[PDB]
Symmetry: C3
Subunit: 156 residues, 3 copies
């Protein structure tokens, strides 16, 4: 199973940083950075090993957010939009679109409450087009997926 | 006074579990489970003693949520909706409705910020109809009322 | 630099209490009260020294809220609305309006997620009109500006 495991108790928080910098269509690759607050990814992944798939171990409602920072690396060029979408695997649960000015930075954040069943597999896909992809990149280390568990277990 | 007391400091959290399993119209009965995170109910109630009335001791804004899980216990039967509504005692402050498929589970969550005055009495009423009530039940221990205090006292 | 400094780590919280009681148009004056939860204002301000300007040291998304409590001090008089608006210095990021009955109390709360860049200067302006200003006041110590940092730094 290539996925990392997120096992959160109520009131506990985890965040994942995207390895990607190029705006390439498809699943982002995530890792846990122990220098950041929160619980680490589990299920057999090594220290800072990145994965495109995540499994949420506990059923619950989670506040889930995306943050994305972009920057224009090719002077005088690029425009369009860049989107992220969280997909339940195997419509988007949570989506974030950020517009790029033809300022040389762009930023977006979006979160929401999501119900996630035990064992729920998750992926995040990025989409943009050629004009943006050829001139802009993700700022390194600033694309983050956050999860906060709101709800409890059933009493023993 | 039959009510349990919720005395929360800023930044502190309490949750109550519903004793009910039958979908009967009227006030739900709540207790604090010490095996769950958060502050316990106070004001003279015994260990896991349930109550239909709650009094919030401190004036403030609280994030308040309901969670409800239901399950079809009579094979091949039941449909409709089930509602919860928080009432200020003695319009609903917070309401949650969940639709039941004619899957054998249903789930809902709703929260919101509420201003609650010192001493504010609270009850939660459940409503549904015969068809749902005769075939579905609350999953045991998964109906929860959560309160999180956002705001502070006046400085001394 | 007359501003107080807010230097918050991820997951950390700070709140400021307004010194003002009169409903006078213009910037409110804020101080940190160590008797309240959260991180203190920094940047050279003394113990409970109040300031009209705040600088947020770390770039991030913050949940920011205003709370305001008002009370009718002149019996049988006053009506209108009172507004607060957070301004990025040097449209309003966050705004709260509270209506005053011609009950002798009024209350409002509003919060929202805001993206704040490193070094972002902030002020809060109050507005009302003569009729309200001549009969109502801010309850002392109950006007609060809260900030909670949601997002992380870039990994080292």
């Amino acid at each position: 199973d290539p996925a990392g495991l997120l096992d959160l108790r109520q009131g506990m928080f985890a965040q994942l940083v995207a390895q990607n910098v190029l705006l390439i269509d498809g699943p982002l690759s995530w890792y846990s950075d122990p220098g950041l607050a929160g619980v680490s990814l589990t299920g057999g992944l090594s220290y800072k090993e990145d994965t495109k798939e995540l499994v949420v171990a506990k059923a619950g409602v989670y506040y889930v957010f995306f943050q994305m920072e972009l920057r224009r690396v090719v002077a005088g060029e690029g425009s369009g939009s860049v989107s992220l979408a969280l997909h339940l695997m195997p419509a988007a649960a949570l989506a974030l679109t950020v517009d790029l000015p033809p300022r040389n930075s762009a930023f977006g954040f979006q979160g929401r409450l999501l119900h996630l069943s035990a064992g729920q597999r998750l992926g995040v896909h990025l989409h943009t087009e050629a004009r943006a992809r050829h001139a802009w990149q993700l700022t390194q280390g600033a694309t983050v997926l956050g999860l906060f568990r709101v709800t409890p277990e059933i009493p023993a």
